[PDB]
Coordinates of C-alpha atoms and ligand atoms in Angstrom, one line a residue:
Chain A
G18 CA 3.9 -14.9 35.8
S19 CA 6.5 -13.2 33.6
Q20 CA 4.9 -12.1 30.4
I21 CA 2.6 -9.2 29.4
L22 CA -0.3 -10.1 27.0
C23 CA -1.9 -7.6 24.7
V24 CA -5.3 -8.4 23.1
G25 CA -6.4 -6.6 20.0
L26 CA -5.7 -6.1 16.3
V27 CA -2.9 -6.9 13.8
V28 CA -2.7 -5.1 10.5
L29 CA -0.5 -4.8 7.4
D30 CA 0.3 -1.1 7.0
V31 CA 1.3 -0.1 3.5
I32 CA 3.0 3.2 4.0
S33 CA 3.8 6.1 1.7
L34 CA 5.9 9.0 2.9
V35 CA 5.0 12.3 1.3
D36 CA 6.2 15.9 1.9
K37 CA 2.8 17.3 1.7
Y38 CA -0.7 15.9 2.0
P39 CA -2.4 15.5 -1.4
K40 CA -5.2 17.8 -2.5
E41 CA -8.4 15.9 -3.5
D42 CA -8.2 14.9 -7.2
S43 CA -4.5 15.6 -7.5
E44 CA -1.4 13.5 -7.9
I45 CA 1.7 13.7 -5.7
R46 CA 4.9 11.6 -5.8
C47 CA 6.0 9.9 -2.6
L48 CA 9.4 10.2 -1.0
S49 CA 9.6 6.5 0.0
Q50 CA 7.5 3.4 0.6
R51 CA 7.5 0.6 3.2
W52 CA 5.4 -2.1 5.0
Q53 CA 4.9 -2.2 8.7
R54 CA 3.2 -4.5 11.2
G55 CA 0.4 -2.3 12.6
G56 CA -2.7 -2.6 14.8
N57 CA -2.8 -1.2 18.3
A58 CA -2.1 -4.4 20.3
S59 CA 0.4 -5.3 17.7
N60 CA 2.2 -2.0 17.9
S61 CA 2.3 -2.2 21.7
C62 CA 4.0 -5.6 21.6
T63 CA 6.7 -4.1 19.4
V64 CA 7.3 -1.4 21.9
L65 CA 7.2 -3.6 25.0
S66 CA 9.6 -5.9 23.2
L67 CA 12.1 -3.2 22.2
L68 CA 12.0 -2.1 25.9
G69 CA 13.0 -5.6 27.1
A70 CA 9.7 -7.0 28.4
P71 CA 8.6 -10.5 27.3
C72 CA 5.2 -10.3 25.8
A73 CA 2.6 -12.0 23.7
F74 CA 0.0 -10.9 21.1
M75 CA -3.5 -12.3 20.8
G76 CA -5.8 -11.5 17.9
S77 CA -7.3 -13.0 14.8
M78 CA -5.4 -13.8 11.7
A79 CA -6.2 -15.5 8.4
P80 CA -3.5 -17.9 7.0
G81 CA -1.8 -16.7 3.9
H82 CA 1.2 -14.6 2.7
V83 CA 0.1 -11.5 4.6
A84 CA 0.0 -13.4 7.8
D85 CA 3.3 -15.0 6.9
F86 CA 4.8 -11.5 6.8
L87 CA 3.3 -10.4 10.1
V88 CA 4.3 -13.6 11.9
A89 CA 7.8 -13.4 10.6
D90 CA 8.0 -9.8 12.0
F91 CA 6.5 -10.8 15.3
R92 CA 9.0 -13.6 15.8
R93 CA 11.9 -11.3 14.6
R94 CA 10.9 -9.2 17.6
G95 CA 10.5 -12.1 20.0
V96 CA 6.8 -11.7 20.4
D97 CA 5.0 -14.9 21.4
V98 CA 2.3 -15.6 18.8
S99 CA 1.2 -19.0 20.3
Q100 CA -2.0 -17.5 21.5
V101 CA -3.2 -16.3 18.0
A102 CA -6.8 -17.2 17.3
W103 CA -6.4 -18.4 13.7
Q104 CA -9.3 -18.4 11.3
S105 CA -10.6 -19.5 7.9
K106 CA -13.3 -16.9 7.0
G107 CA -12.2 -13.4 6.0
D108 CA -8.8 -11.9 5.1
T109 CA -6.2 -10.3 7.3
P110 CA -6.9 -6.5 7.4
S111 CA -4.7 -4.0 5.6
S112 CA -4.5 -0.3 5.2
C113 CA -3.1 2.5 3.2
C114 CA -1.2 5.0 5.3
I115 CA -0.2 8.4 4.1
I116 CA 2.4 10.0 6.4
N117 CA 3.2 13.7 6.0
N118 CA 6.9 14.1 6.4
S119 CA 6.6 17.7 7.4
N120 CA 4.6 17.2 10.6
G121 CA 4.3 13.5 10.8
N122 CA 0.6 13.7 10.4
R123 CA -0.8 10.3 9.4
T124 CA -3.9 9.4 7.5
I125 CA -5.1 5.8 7.5
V126 CA -7.5 4.2 5.1
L127 CA -8.4 0.9 6.8
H128 CA -9.9 -2.2 5.2
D129 CA -11.7 -4.5 7.6
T130 CA -12.1 -8.0 6.2
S131 CA -15.0 -9.5 8.3
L132 CA -12.3 -11.4 10.2
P133 CA -14.1 -12.6 13.4
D134 CA -12.9 -11.0 16.6
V135 CA -11.4 -13.0 19.5
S136 CA -14.3 -14.3 21.6
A137 CA -14.8 -15.1 25.3
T138 CA -14.5 -18.8 24.2
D139 CA -11.0 -18.2 22.6
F140 CA -9.8 -16.5 25.7
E141 CA -11.2 -19.1 28.1
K142 CA -8.6 -21.4 26.4
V143 CA -5.7 -19.4 27.7
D144 CA -3.3 -20.2 30.6
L145 CA -3.5 -17.1 32.8
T146 CA -0.5 -18.3 34.9
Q147 CA 2.1 -17.0 32.4
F148 CA 0.9 -13.4 32.7
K149 CA 1.8 -10.5 35.1
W150 CA -0.2 -8.1 33.1
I151 CA -3.0 -8.2 30.4
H152 CA -4.0 -5.3 28.2
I153 CA -7.2 -5.1 26.1
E154 CA -7.9 -2.9 23.1
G155 CA -11.6 -2.2 23.3
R156 CA -13.2 -3.7 20.2
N157 CA -16.0 -6.2 20.9
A158 CA -17.4 -5.0 24.2
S159 CA -19.9 -7.6 25.3
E160 CA -17.5 -10.5 24.6
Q161 CA -14.5 -8.6 26.1
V162 CA -16.3 -7.9 29.4
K163 CA -16.6 -11.7 29.6
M164 CA -12.9 -12.1 29.3
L165 CA -12.4 -9.4 32.0
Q166 CA -14.6 -11.1 34.6
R167 CA -12.7 -14.3 34.0
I168 CA -9.5 -12.5 35.1
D169 CA -11.1 -11.0 38.2
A170 CA -12.3 -14.5 39.2
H171 CA -8.7 -15.8 38.8
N172 CA -7.6 -12.9 40.9
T173 CA -10.0 -13.5 43.7
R174 CA -8.2 -16.8 44.1
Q175 CA -4.7 -15.4 44.4
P176 CA -2.4 -13.7 47.0
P177 CA -2.4 -9.9 46.4
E178 CA 1.2 -10.6 45.2
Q179 CA 0.1 -13.0 42.4
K180 CA -2.9 -11.2 40.9
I181 CA -2.9 -10.2 37.3
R182 CA -2.8 -6.5 36.5
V183 CA -5.4 -5.4 33.9
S184 CA -5.4 -2.3 31.6
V185 CA -8.0 -1.3 29.2
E186 CA -8.1 1.1 26.2
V187 CA -11.3 2.8 25.1
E188 CA -10.1 4.4 21.9
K189 CA -13.2 4.8 19.8
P190 CA -16.2 7.2 20.4
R191 CA -18.7 4.3 20.5
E192 CA -21.4 3.7 23.1
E193 CA -20.9 -0.1 23.2
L194 CA -17.4 0.5 24.5
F195 CA -18.2 2.7 27.5
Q196 CA -19.0 -0.4 29.6
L197 CA -15.3 -1.1 29.6
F198 CA -14.8 2.1 31.5
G199 CA -15.3 -0.2 33.4
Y200 CA -12.8 -2.8 34.5
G201 CA -9.1 -3.1 35.0
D202 CA -6.7 -1.3 37.3
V203 CA -5.6 1.2 34.6
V204 CA -8.0 2.8 32.0
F205 CA -6.8 4.6 28.9
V206 CA -9.2 7.0 27.2
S207 CA -8.2 8.8 24.0
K208 CA -8.4 12.6 23.3
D209 CA -10.7 11.7 20.4
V210 CA -13.1 10.0 22.8
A211 CA -12.9 12.9 25.3
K212 CA -13.8 15.6 22.8
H213 CA -16.6 13.6 21.3
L214 CA -18.0 13.3 24.8
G215 CA -17.9 17.1 25.0
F216 CA -14.6 17.7 26.9
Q217 CA -12.0 20.1 25.7
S218 CA -9.0 19.2 27.9
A219 CA -7.5 16.2 29.7
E220 CA -8.1 17.4 33.3
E221 CA -11.7 18.1 32.3
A222 CA -12.2 14.7 30.7
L223 CA -10.5 13.1 33.8
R224 CA -12.9 14.8 36.3
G225 CA -15.9 14.0 34.0
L226 CA -15.1 10.3 33.5
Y227 CA -13.6 9.2 36.8
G228 CA -17.0 8.3 38.1
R229 CA -17.3 5.4 35.7
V230 CA -14.3 3.5 36.9
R231 CA -13.8 0.6 39.2
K232 CA -13.0 1.6 42.7
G233 CA -9.2 2.0 43.0
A234 CA -8.5 2.5 39.3
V235 CA -6.2 5.0 37.6
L236 CA -7.8 6.8 34.7
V237 CA -5.2 8.0 32.1
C238 CA -5.7 10.5 29.2
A239 CA -3.1 11.5 26.7
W240 CA -3.5 14.8 24.7
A241 CA -0.8 14.7 21.9
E242 CA 1.6 17.6 22.1
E243 CA -0.1 18.9 25.3
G244 CA 1.2 16.0 27.2
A245 CA -0.8 13.5 29.3
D246 CA -2.7 13.5 32.6
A247 CA -3.8 10.9 35.0
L248 CA -6.1 10.7 38.1
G249 CA -6.5 8.0 40.8
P250 CA -8.3 7.2 44.0
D251 CA -6.8 10.1 46.0
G252 CA -8.3 12.7 43.7
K253 CA -5.0 14.2 43.0
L254 CA -4.5 15.1 39.3
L255 CA -1.2 14.2 37.8
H256 CA 0.4 15.8 34.8
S257 CA 3.4 15.4 32.4
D258 CA 4.7 17.7 29.7
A259 CA 5.3 16.2 26.3
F260 CA 8.8 15.5 25.0
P261 CA 8.5 16.8 21.4
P262 CA 11.4 16.1 19.1
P263 CA 12.8 19.0 17.1
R264 CA 11.4 17.6 13.8
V265 CA 8.2 15.6 14.0
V266 CA 8.3 13.2 11.1
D267 CA 5.9 10.3 11.8
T268 CA 3.2 10.0 14.5
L269 CA 1.8 6.6 13.3
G270 CA 1.4 4.6 16.5
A271 CA 2.5 7.4 18.9
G272 CA -0.4 6.5 21.2
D273 CA 0.4 2.9 21.1
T274 CA 4.0 3.7 22.1
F275 CA 2.6 5.8 24.9
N276 CA 0.3 3.0 26.2
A277 CA 3.0 0.4 26.0
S278 CA 5.5 2.5 27.9
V279 CA 3.1 3.4 30.7
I280 CA 2.3 -0.3 31.2
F281 CA 6.0 -1.3 31.1
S282 CA 6.8 1.3 33.7
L283 CA 3.9 0.5 36.0
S284 CA 4.5 -3.2 35.6
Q285 CA 8.1 -2.5 36.9
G286 CA 6.9 -1.0 40.1
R287 CA 7.2 2.7 39.2
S288 CA 4.8 5.4 40.4
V289 CA 2.0 6.8 38.3
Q290 CA 3.9 10.1 37.9
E291 CA 7.0 8.2 36.7
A292 CA 5.0 6.0 34.4
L293 CA 3.2 9.0 32.9
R294 CA 6.5 10.8 32.4
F295 CA 8.1 7.7 30.7
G296 CA 5.1 7.3 28.5
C297 CA 5.6 10.8 27.2
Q298 CA 9.3 10.3 26.8
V299 CA 9.2 7.2 24.6
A300 CA 6.3 8.6 22.4
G301 CA 8.2 11.8 21.9
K302 CA 11.2 9.9 20.7
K303 CA 9.2 7.7 18.3
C304 CA 7.6 10.7 16.6
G305 CA 11.0 12.0 15.5
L306 CA 11.7 8.7 13.7
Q307 CA 10.3 6.6 10.8
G308 CA 9.0 3.4 12.4
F309 CA 10.0 1.9 15.8
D310 CA 13.7 0.8 15.6
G311 CA 15.7 3.7 17.0
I312 CA 13.7 4.3 20.2
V313 CA 16.2 2.3 22.3
Chain B
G13 CA 12.1 -23.9 -20.2
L14 CA 12.6 -24.1 -24.0
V15 CA 11.1 -21.0 -25.8
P16 CA 10.8 -21.8 -29.6
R17 CA 12.8 -19.5 -31.8
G18 CA 11.0 -16.3 -33.0
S19 CA 7.8 -17.2 -31.0
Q20 CA 7.4 -14.5 -28.3
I21 CA 6.4 -10.8 -28.1
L22 CA 8.5 -8.9 -25.6
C23 CA 7.3 -5.8 -23.7
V24 CA 9.8 -3.5 -22.0
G25 CA 8.7 -1.1 -19.3
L26 CA 7.2 -0.5 -15.9
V27 CA 5.4 -2.8 -13.4
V28 CA 3.9 -1.3 -10.3
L29 CA 1.6 -2.4 -7.5
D30 CA -1.5 -0.3 -7.2
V31 CA -3.4 -0.4 -3.9
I32 CA -6.9 0.9 -4.8
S33 CA -9.4 2.1 -2.2
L34 CA -13.0 3.1 -2.7
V35 CA -14.1 5.6 0.0
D36 CA -17.3 7.4 1.0
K37 CA -15.6 10.8 1.1
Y38 CA -12.1 12.1 0.8
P39 CA -10.4 11.8 4.2
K40 CA -9.1 14.8 6.1
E41 CA -5.4 14.8 6.9
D42 CA -4.7 12.9 10.0
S43 CA -8.0 10.9 10.1
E44 CA -8.6 7.2 10.2
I45 CA -11.4 5.8 8.1
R46 CA -13.0 2.6 6.7
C47 CA -12.9 2.1 2.9
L48 CA -15.9 0.6 1.2
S49 CA -13.5 -1.8 -0.6
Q50 CA -9.8 -2.2 -1.3
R51 CA -7.9 -3.9 -4.1
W52 CA -4.3 -4.7 -5.0
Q53 CA -3.7 -4.6 -8.8
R54 CA -0.7 -5.1 -11.0
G55 CA -0.3 -2.0 -13.1
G56 CA 2.2 -0.2 -15.5
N57 CA 2.0 0.0 -19.3
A58 CA 4.3 -2.7 -20.4
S59 CA 2.8 -4.9 -17.6
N60 CA -0.8 -4.4 -18.8
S61 CA 0.0 -5.0 -22.5
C62 CA 1.5 -8.4 -21.5
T63 CA -1.7 -9.4 -19.7
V64 CA -3.7 -8.4 -22.8
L65 CA -1.4 -10.3 -25.2
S66 CA -1.6 -13.5 -23.1
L67 CA -5.4 -13.4 -23.1
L68 CA -5.3 -12.9 -26.9
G69 CA -3.2 -16.1 -27.1
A70 CA 0.3 -14.8 -27.8
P71 CA 3.3 -16.2 -26.0
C72 CA 4.8 -13.1 -24.3
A73 CA 7.5 -11.9 -21.9
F74 CA 7.8 -8.9 -19.7
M75 CA 11.1 -7.1 -19.1
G76 CA 11.4 -4.6 -16.3
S77 CA 13.1 -3.8 -13.0
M78 CA 12.1 -5.3 -9.6
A79 CA 13.6 -5.6 -6.1
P80 CA 13.4 -8.8 -4.0
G81 CA 10.7 -8.6 -1.4
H82 CA 7.1 -9.2 -0.8
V83 CA 5.8 -6.6 -3.4
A84 CA 7.8 -8.3 -6.2
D85 CA 6.4 -11.7 -4.9
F86 CA 2.9 -10.5 -5.5
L87 CA 3.7 -8.9 -8.8
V88 CA 5.4 -12.1 -9.9
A89 CA 2.6 -14.3 -8.8
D90 CA 0.1 -12.1 -10.6
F91 CA 2.2 -12.1 -13.8
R92 CA 2.0 -15.8 -13.7
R93 CA -1.7 -15.9 -12.9
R94 CA -1.9 -14.3 -16.4
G95 CA 0.5 -16.7 -18.2
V96 CA 3.3 -14.0 -18.6
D97 CA 6.9 -15.2 -19.0
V98 CA 8.7 -13.3 -16.3
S99 CA 12.2 -14.6 -16.8
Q100 CA 13.9 -11.5 -18.3
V101 CA 13.1 -9.3 -15.3
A102 CA 16.1 -7.1 -14.4
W103 CA 16.5 -7.8 -10.6
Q104 CA 18.0 -4.9 -8.7
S105 CA 20.2 -4.8 -5.5
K106 CA 19.2 -1.2 -4.9
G107 CA 15.8 0.5 -4.5
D108 CA 12.1 -0.1 -4.2
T109 CA 9.7 -2.2 -6.4
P110 CA 7.2 0.6 -7.4
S111 CA 4.0 0.8 -5.4
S112 CA 1.2 3.4 -5.9
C113 CA -1.8 4.3 -3.8
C114 CA -5.1 5.4 -5.3
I115 CA -8.2 6.8 -3.5
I116 CA -11.5 6.9 -5.3
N117 CA -14.3 9.0 -3.9
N118 CA -17.6 7.0 -4.1
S119 CA -19.8 10.1 -3.9
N120 CA -18.3 12.0 -6.9
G121 CA -16.0 9.7 -8.9
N122 CA -12.8 11.8 -8.3
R123 CA -9.4 10.1 -8.2
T124 CA -6.6 11.1 -5.9
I125 CA -3.2 9.4 -6.6
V126 CA -0.1 9.0 -4.5
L127 CA 2.5 8.0 -7.1
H128 CA 5.4 5.5 -6.6
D129 CA 8.9 6.6 -5.5
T130 CA 11.8 7.0 -7.9
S131 CA 14.5 4.8 -6.2
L132 CA 14.4 1.8 -8.5
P133 CA 16.9 1.9 -11.4
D134 CA 15.4 1.5 -14.9
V135 CA 16.5 -1.1 -17.3
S136 CA 19.8 -0.2 -18.9
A137 CA 21.3 -0.7 -22.3
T138 CA 23.8 -3.1 -20.7
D139 CA 21.0 -5.0 -18.9
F140 CA 19.5 -5.4 -22.3
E141 CA 22.8 -6.3 -24.0
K142 CA 22.6 -9.6 -22.1
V143 CA 19.4 -10.8 -23.7
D144 CA 19.4 -13.3 -26.5
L145 CA 17.0 -12.0 -29.2
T146 CA 16.3 -15.1 -31.3
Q147 CA 13.3 -15.8 -29.1
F148 CA 11.3 -12.8 -30.1
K149 CA 9.3 -12.0 -33.3
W150 CA 8.3 -8.6 -32.0
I151 CA 9.6 -6.3 -29.3
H152 CA 7.7 -3.3 -27.9
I153 CA 9.1 -0.6 -25.8
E154 CA 7.4 1.7 -23.3
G155 CA 9.3 5.0 -23.6
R156 CA 10.8 5.8 -20.2
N157 CA 14.6 6.4 -20.0
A158 CA 15.1 7.6 -23.5
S159 CA 18.9 7.8 -24.1
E160 CA 19.3 4.2 -22.8
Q161 CA 16.4 2.8 -24.8
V162 CA 17.9 4.3 -28.0
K163 CA 20.9 2.0 -27.6
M164 CA 18.5 -1.0 -27.2
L165 CA 16.8 0.0 -30.5
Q166 CA 20.2 0.3 -32.2
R167 CA 21.0 -3.2 -31.0
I168 CA 17.9 -4.6 -32.6
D169 CA 18.7 -2.8 -35.8
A170 CA 22.2 -4.4 -35.8
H171 CA 20.6 -7.8 -35.1
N172 CA 18.2 -7.4 -38.0
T173 CA 20.9 -6.4 -40.5
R174 CA 22.3 -10.0 -40.6
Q175 CA 19.0 -11.8 -41.0
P176 CA 16.6 -13.1 -43.7
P177 CA 13.5 -10.9 -44.1
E178 CA 11.4 -13.6 -42.5
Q179 CA 13.4 -13.7 -39.3
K180 CA 13.7 -9.9 -38.8
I181 CA 12.3 -8.7 -35.5
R182 CA 9.5 -6.1 -35.7
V183 CA 9.8 -3.2 -33.3
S184 CA 7.2 -0.9 -31.8
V185 CA 7.6 2.2 -29.6
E186 CA 5.2 3.9 -27.3
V187 CA 5.4 7.6 -26.1
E188 CA 2.6 8.3 -23.6
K189 CA 4.2 11.0 -21.4
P190 CA 4.7 14.6 -22.4
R191 CA 8.4 14.6 -21.7
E192 CA 10.9 16.1 -24.2
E193 CA 13.4 13.4 -23.6
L194 CA 11.0 10.9 -25.1
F195 CA 10.5 12.5 -28.5
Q196 CA 13.8 11.2 -29.9
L197 CA 12.1 7.8 -29.7
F198 CA 9.8 8.8 -32.7
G199 CA 12.8 8.0 -34.9
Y200 CA 12.8 4.3 -34.0
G201 CA 10.3 1.5 -34.6
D202 CA 8.3 0.1 -37.5
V203 CA 5.3 1.2 -35.4
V204 CA 5.1 4.3 -33.1
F205 CA 2.1 4.8 -30.8
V206 CA 1.5 8.4 -29.6
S207 CA -1.0 9.2 -26.9
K208 CA -3.7 11.9 -27.0
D209 CA -2.2 13.5 -23.9
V210 CA 1.2 14.0 -25.8
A211 CA -0.4 15.3 -29.0
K212 CA -2.4 17.9 -27.1
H213 CA 0.6 19.1 -25.1
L214 CA 2.3 19.5 -28.5
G215 CA -0.8 21.5 -29.4
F216 CA -2.6 19.2 -31.7
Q217 CA -6.4 19.1 -31.3
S218 CA -7.1 15.8 -33.0
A219 CA -5.7 12.5 -34.1
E220 CA -5.5 13.7 -37.7
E221 CA -3.7 16.8 -36.7
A222 CA -1.2 14.8 -34.6
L223 CA -0.5 12.3 -37.4
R224 CA 0.1 14.9 -40.1
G225 CA 2.0 17.1 -37.7
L226 CA 4.5 14.5 -36.4
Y227 CA 4.9 12.0 -39.2
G228 CA 8.1 13.8 -40.3
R229 CA 9.7 12.5 -37.1
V230 CA 9.5 8.8 -37.8
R231 CA 12.0 6.6 -39.8
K232 CA 11.2 5.9 -43.4
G233 CA 8.7 3.1 -43.7
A234 CA 7.2 3.5 -40.3
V235 CA 3.6 3.6 -39.3
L236 CA 2.4 6.2 -36.8
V237 CA -0.7 5.6 -34.7
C238 CA -2.9 7.6 -32.3
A239 CA -6.0 6.6 -30.4
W240 CA -8.4 9.4 -29.3
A241 CA -11.0 8.1 -26.8
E242 CA -14.5 8.1 -28.3
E243 CA -13.3 9.6 -31.6
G244 CA -11.8 6.3 -32.5
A245 CA -8.2 5.9 -33.8
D246 CA -6.1 6.9 -36.9
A247 CA -2.9 5.6 -38.5
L248 CA -0.6 7.0 -41.1
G249 CA 2.0 5.0 -43.1
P250 CA 4.6 5.6 -45.9
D251 CA 2.0 6.0 -48.7
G252 CA 0.4 9.1 -47.0
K253 CA -3.1 7.7 -46.8
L254 CA -4.8 8.4 -43.4
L255 CA -6.5 5.3 -42.1
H256 CA -9.4 5.4 -39.6
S257 CA -11.7 3.5 -37.3
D258 CA -14.5 4.5 -35.1
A259 CA -14.8 3.5 -31.5
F260 CA -17.0 0.7 -30.2
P261 CA -18.4 2.2 -26.9
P262 CA -19.4 -0.5 -24.3
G270 CA -5.9 0.5 -19.0
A271 CA -7.8 0.8 -22.3
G272 CA -4.9 2.6 -24.0
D273 CA -2.8 -0.4 -23.1
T274 CA -5.5 -2.8 -24.3
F275 CA -5.5 -0.8 -27.6
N276 CA -1.7 -0.8 -28.1
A277 CA -1.5 -4.5 -27.3
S278 CA -4.4 -5.4 -29.5
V279 CA -2.9 -3.5 -32.5
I280 CA 0.5 -5.2 -32.0
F281 CA -1.2 -8.6 -31.8
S282 CA -3.1 -8.1 -35.1
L283 CA -0.1 -6.8 -37.0
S284 CA 2.0 -9.6 -35.6
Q285 CA -0.6 -12.1 -36.9
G286 CA 0.1 -10.6 -40.3
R287 CA -3.1 -8.5 -40.7
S288 CA -3.2 -5.1 -42.4
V289 CA -2.9 -1.8 -40.6
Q290 CA -6.6 -1.1 -41.3
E291 CA -7.7 -4.4 -39.9
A292 CA -5.4 -3.7 -36.9
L293 CA -7.0 -0.3 -36.1
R294 CA -10.3 -2.0 -36.3
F295 CA -9.4 -4.9 -34.0
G296 CA -7.7 -2.6 -31.6
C297 CA -10.9 -0.6 -31.4
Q298 CA -13.2 -3.6 -30.7
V299 CA -11.1 -5.0 -27.8
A300 CA -10.5 -1.7 -26.0
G301 CA -14.3 -1.2 -26.3
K302 CA -15.0 -4.5 -24.6
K303 CA -12.3 -3.7 -21.9
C304 CA -13.9 -0.4 -20.9
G305 CA -17.2 -2.1 -20.1
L306 CA -15.4 -4.6 -17.9
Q307 CA -13.7 -4.7 -14.5
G308 CA -10.1 -5.8 -14.9
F309 CA -8.9 -7.5 -18.1
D310 CA -10.8 -10.8 -17.5
Ligands
LIG1 C1 2.0 12.2 25.3 C2 2.3 11.2 24.2 C3 2.4 11.9 22.9 N1 3.4 12.8 22.6 N2 3.1 13.2 21.3 C4 3.8 14.2 20.6 C5 4.2 14.1 19.3 C6 4.8 15.2 18.6 C7 5.1 16.3 19.3 C8 4.8 16.4 20.7 C9 4.2 15.4 21.3 C10 1.9 12.6 20.8 C11 1.2 12.7 19.6 C12 0.1 11.9 19.4 N3 -0.6 12.1 18.1 C13 -2.0 11.6 17.9 C14 -2.5 12.4 16.7 C15 -2.4 11.7 15.3 N4 -1.3 12.4 14.6 C16 -1.2 13.8 15.0 C17 -1.6 13.7 16.5 C18 -0.3 13.4 17.4 C19 -0.3 11.0 20.4 C20 0.3 10.9 21.6 C21 1.5 11.7 21.8

């Protein structure tokens, strides 16, 4: 098993770069424009790829010129798309992204297109033998849990040296998702989810939510410019300072870059401290750049 | 393919891709939200007029700048969806094909606009030097880069000099932005459209004010035209008689300019053209798109 698989969304991001966020009802002129292959699982694949780890994306896509663009980009990055759950109903999602060039704040107006999510069925049709690691962007709970149990099963029939590592991201404050909290060896929970659950810091969210996780799991929580924290089975809290760049110019997919990096690091044998640290280092570098290119 | 001589109406100006999102409420900086709906539309003045002229049944051509890429590809396919001849486009090796982003608030109607970047070079007098003119009966110019467009109008003038009256090319000019550089364009064209927004900025409070105030700026023999929303539209020619037409309540300005051009190009009178202009732009306003 040599590849890392990420399961979630792909999206066409239509980006405008402005030097100040527009006031309601006003009209600004943008500095520059570009398109980008977005979506969480999609972004992660880009980062894993640029870091040298063979990987594969799996999510829904409607055939057309949009998809043509996205696939071209995938392949230009060496991301295996063979596992894509093609469709006929709905369109491929897109979004308008305003990025504030004076602090890299990014505002996203998303357009979901009814596109049916990957289902337990779809996943059942996948050859788990190719994959050292599988990461799942929490969207359709019920059905995703099903996929998770399938991987455990497969694991219960393997040497502890041939099991598939599983990470899970609960990014949205949404009750259906808290079941995911859940499975996997590594669980990512967003700052946004932690506040909405009443918590006002990472160590606090970490102490509050550790109870929900599979025995032996590592819970991970990033907190933007305050760094990231983690907490595992020994009860010892781990921390890493951020690596802010001098000028923050674009934070679109900062958290995806963080997630990808921590996975990469852990999948390469490194410790949780080290992975946490590396997570912060790559995310920091991305935020000082437009897009993904220059991080390596 | 073969365009028959003196058969087409040419429009020179901007094309742009508008991404249009309808939202519950204006988003706060650094949020992520779901729009109610989202739409990609071809926009720009010369671009919209072409669409209108096609639907009216005129052969017509667009001339503007684009850059190779997926935005142009959409723009080009949409141009063709509407029967527009796209073969005089000025392709550019530098810059971005214009793209604009518009947010419309469902619970208040307000429009927030992120306007396109400035990187793409406009069409130049030398770009335009390369065009063979015998194809066009009428040419219409969206005022943008004025000093360069004046050369283009001088070229058409030269062309016309050596031609029978019945193979002269009619010329119309459109000044929609309050930008001083544009006002020199008033001096060119058989027909000059001025927008309400420009008249007001010059301090005129009505079409009739605008027409009387600015007619001294047009070449001898020209007709000056100004549409004023629900107040209808006026026109003033060489004889000094103000012509008028009321609105017909149900890109309307573009639907209006294009409709007037069509009617005059079909040989109707200015009065009949104001009227026609008013009917169509009425119909457009109670419609979604140009369909
Ligand atoms: C620890 C990883 C990381 N560093 N920086 C980081 C970036 C710049 C300076 C310092 C740290 C982040 C910023 C993020 N975002 C999410 C929000 C959406 N836009 C504004 C917020 C920033 C997310 C993760 C990280």
